[PDB]
From Swiss-Prot:
Domain of life where this protein originates: Viruses
Known function: RNA-dependent RNA polymerase, which is responsible for the replication and transcription of the viral RNA genome using antigenomic RNA as an intermediate. During transcription, synthesizes subgenomic RNAs and assures their capping by a cap-snatching mechanism, which involves the endonuclease activity cleaving the host capped pre-mRNAs. These short capped RNAs are then used as primers for viral transcription. The 3'-end of subgenomic mRNAs molecules are not polyadenylated. During replication, the polymerase binds the 5' and 3' vRNA extremities at distinct sites.
Binding positions for Zn(2+) per the UniProt entry: 2, 11, 15
Subcellular location: Host Golgi apparatus; Host endoplasmic reticulum; Host endoplasmic reticulum-Golgi intermediate compartment; Virion
Full-sequence portion shown in this chain: 2168 to 2237 of 2263
Organism field: Bunyavirus La Crosse
Protein name in UniProt: RNA-directed RNA polymerase L
Family of this protein: Belongs to the Bunyavirales RNA polymerase family.
Subunit structure: Homomultimer. Interacts with the glycoprotein N; this interaction allows efficient polymerase packaging into virus particles. Interacts with nucleoprotein N.
Domain characteristics, as noted in the entry: The N-terminus contains the endonuclease activity (endoN). The central region contains the RdRp activity. The C-terminus contains the cap-binding region.
Misc. remarks from the entry: Classified as His(+) endonuclease since it has a histidine upstream of the active site that coordinates the first cation.
Length: 59
């Protein structure tokens, strides 16, 4: 994300990252994020969501 912000000239809007507590809302966001297919990211993004949902459910 940092790299693509660097490429799009939004370097300024990466180090300016804060908290948007609402853990039920965080769970909603994460479960609803779509998964891609063509990119090598297809497995990584889903793995990321799986780990995040398992960790938050444990938490």
């Amino acid at each position: 994300i940092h790299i693509c912000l660097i490429k799009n000239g939004m370097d300024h809007m990466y180090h300016s990252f804060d908290v948007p507590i609402n853990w039920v809302m965080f769970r909603e966001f994460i479960n609803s994020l779509p998964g891609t297919d063509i990119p090598p990211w297809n497995v990584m993004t889903e793995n990321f969501k799986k780990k995040c949902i398992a960790l938050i459910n444990s938490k």
